[PDB]
Write a protein that binds this ligand. Structure first.
Ligand SMILES: [Ca+2]
Ligand SMILES: [Ca+2]
Ligand SMILES: [Cl-]
Ligand SMILES: [Cl-]
Ligand SMILES: [Cl-]
Ligand SMILES: [Cl-]
Lengths: 200, 200
């Protein structure tokens, strides 16, 4: 009876693993599972081009995973661990801004990013709530990152094996509970975008 | 600047209201917000064509809307209100089945659904969690509803005048805490699809 068994690819298995960790992040209330998913988001694309299984079904599945792990999960983790009337306001504006970001990503292509990508935007928020324990600072930073996600500031995507790797060991360090390296590297990636937008 | 303002439309505004509702359904943990979320999804697309402001961005955003409203929200709702190791395995399979069936819907342009639609599958699950206070029974149906989503059962989609109205009149009674008519219409839709498939 099942038909999509003929359209699933080996790369789609990894995206499914990415959705589990992103969903388990919500159910388990653990910031660590997002960092694992940020990696998963970085490899399932590499896998597809390495295994040759580039599918529009898997391309859609890639963004749906980003909706779960990088849109809903950072917003839920923001509110649940910082219960506030204002954090409620902030989580919605974030998770929406991420949803607008991915909707534009679907109508565009792999050329690059129009605004701060949602895996980076998610990493910024999640890492900030781990290090900064205050309702306001993370609620105000989520508004800032959400604006930078629906931004027009151009962002360069370069899936170098070494590039993906240097982000990976930074995220593996974050899986333990040492995300300061992931914080620095993405915030430097974010401030590299703003200067380039002003003038290359 | 924010150049999404030129591609944004009135049809996306209700789509955004749908994401807020399905999002608030997660954080505030009340099944009534999904019943209002099924109304938006059954309306925002109708709103688009009535004003002629359909769009791929809104088409993608409509899919992103159903990812959290009818995938992450019902899975989290099933778990958080029936916190079981047992219920965790079911919530994941329901979410991934919804994510898989949403990846298939995005790549197809048919006047129906190849599986049980994710707006109806979410109605069935949370409707059963509302009426049945049992960790186990809700969990097996979540698995069963999951398989129906990733099925080949051809389902009808005639978003006309009264079919939405009838479905959505019952969906308002679903909000107030009377989901029996919403479930009755939803469960009839489920079996009618499988009896139609059995007919073939
Ligand atoms: Ca990816
Ligand atoms: Ca819709
Ligand atoms: Cl983009
Ligand atoms: Cl993104
Ligand atoms: Cl479909
Ligand atoms: Cl659907």
């Amino acid at each position: 009876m099942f038909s999509i068994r003929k359209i699933i690819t080996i790369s789609d298995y990894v995206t499914m693993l990415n959705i589990i960790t992103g969903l388990l992040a919500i159910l388990l209330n653990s910031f660590s599972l997002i960092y694992l998913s940020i990696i998963f988001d970085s490899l399932d694309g590499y896998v597809a081009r390495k295994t040759g299984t580039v599918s529009d079904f898997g391309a859609e599945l890639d963004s749906i995973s980003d909706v779960v792990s990088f849109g809903v999960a950072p917003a839920y983790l923001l509110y649940n661990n910082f219960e506030s009337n204002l954090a409620l306001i902030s989580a919605i504006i974030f998770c929406l801004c991420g949803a607008l970001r991915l909707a534009r990503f679907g109508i565009l292509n792999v050329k690059g990013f129009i605004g701060l990508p949602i895996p980076a935007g998610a990493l910024l928020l999640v890492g900030f709530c781990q290090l900064i324990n205050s309702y306001l600072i993370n609620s105000i930073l989520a508004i800032l990152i959400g604006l930078l996600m629906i931004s027009d500031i151009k962002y360069p995507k370069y899936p170098n094996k070494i590039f993906i790797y240097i982000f990976a060991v930074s995220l593996c360090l974050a899986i333990v509970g040492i995300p300061h390296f992931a914080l620095m590297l993405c915030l430097i990636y974010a401030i590299y975008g703003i200067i380039k937008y002003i003038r290359g």
